[PDB]
Amino acid sequence: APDSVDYRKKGYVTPVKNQGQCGSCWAFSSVGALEGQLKKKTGKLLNLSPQNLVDCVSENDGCGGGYMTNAFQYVQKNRGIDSEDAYPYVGQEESCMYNPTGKAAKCRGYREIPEGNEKALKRAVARVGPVSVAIDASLTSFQFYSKGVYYDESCNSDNLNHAVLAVGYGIQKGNKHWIIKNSWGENWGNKGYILMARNKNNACGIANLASFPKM
């Protein structure tokens, strides 16, 4: 794998979104990974609908949380996911209103990264594209992140409470990192992004629950 990868520079990544109060980061993470694969497979970048996942993945719990794996499998079994345009985000769970006429991507299932293996995660990001991950994002330091490579001594690898998207990896002033797209809007972090410590004993559980869709 290359020493550095950043799929934002390759047109694989849509603008940062804002999930609002809804605990739907799993849906935004899933959508982000699908968007990357859509761009890779078809050559076009489109905003996909997290609301479609919130409302329709009955295996998950809507604004109460959920797994990306269940999201990918839903898209597969449903034979599609809508564009954001065709199924707009409203930040509250509602009845499923999937519309096949607005279908913008498909999914052939998913693959999982071996638990805790940052090297496998790096190789997957290089080989595949953006990868869905879960992290401990519960700390004060994360909320008020501004710049630099994020590292908090107290981060809890077993407390995977937030889903985000690894869109690349690299190094800043000798400090290795993951490039992470969040879904708390562009006013959070660094225009919606955070660089998170890489190869620092799986900091914040970054490689504990990583997956990506097949397409």
Side-chain angles (χ1 to χ4, degrees), residues 1-48 50-215:
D3 289 346
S4 300
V5 173
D6 186 347
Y7 285 104
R8 296 173 300 179
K9 302 175 176 169
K10 295 178 171 284
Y12 275 50
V13 187
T14 61
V16 170
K17 308 308 193 306
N18 194 334
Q19 66 189 77
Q21 307 316 310
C22 180
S24 53
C25 40
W26 60 268
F28 283 90
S29 179
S30 300
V31 151
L34 288 158
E35 285 165 354
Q37 290 312 287
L38 179 59
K39 167 60 178 184
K40 183 170 187 178
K41 191 185 185 313
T42 72
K44 294 205 95 175
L45 187 65
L46 298 171
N47 297 286
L48 302 177
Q51 192 73 46
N52 186 340
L53 298 180
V54 172
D55 294 352
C56 303
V57 184
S58 61
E59 293 74 14
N60 285 341
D61 297 291
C63 292
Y67 299 104
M68 289 77 86
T69 54
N70 289 333
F72 297 140
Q73 177 154 125
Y74 157 81
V75 175
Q76 180 185 28
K77 297 297 221 64
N78 191 58
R79 302 198 73 257
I81 184 173
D82 281 331
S83 67
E84 166 71 25
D85 174 79
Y87 202 140
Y89 188 70
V90 302
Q92 59 199 16
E93 185 179 349
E94 305 182 332
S95 305
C96 183
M97 292 165 285
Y98 172 73
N99 191 340
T101 67
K103 186 187 316 197
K106 291 184 170 189
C107 179
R108 304 189 62 186
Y110 62 85
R111 309 197 84 91
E112 296 165 307
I113 304 314
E115 185 188 5
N117 191 331
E118 285 190 271
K119 188 175 188 177
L121 181 55
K122 173 190 176 181
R123 289 186 298 245
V125 168
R127 173 183 69 255
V128 176
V131 170
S132 294
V133 302
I135 55 169
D136 176 15
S138 66
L139 296 175
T140 299
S141 55
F142 191 94
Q143 166 119 3
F144 297 109
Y145 172 82
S146 61
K147 298 271 174 46
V149 179
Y150 178 77
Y151 157 69
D152 188 321
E153 308 89 332
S154 298
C155 218
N156 184 358
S157 295
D158 300 271
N159 188 8
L160 305 172
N161 47 61
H162 188 57
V164 290
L165 183 71
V167 298
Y169 58 82
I171 191 160
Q172 176 190 100
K173 293 173 187 179
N175 309 121
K176 291 183 178 189
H177 61 69
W178 300 103
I179 307 169
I180 300 300
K181 187 188 191 193
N182 200 358
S183 52
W184 290 352
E186 290 178 336
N187 282 338
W188 174 87
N190 190 351
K191 305 190 180 192
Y193 283 85
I194 179 170
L195 304 180
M196 296 188 70
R198 177 167 63 92
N199 293 352
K200 293 204 63 174
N201 198 21
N202 193 25
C204 294
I206 183 75
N208 274 349
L209 199 59
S211 64
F212 58 86
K214 306 176 187 187
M215 198 171 285

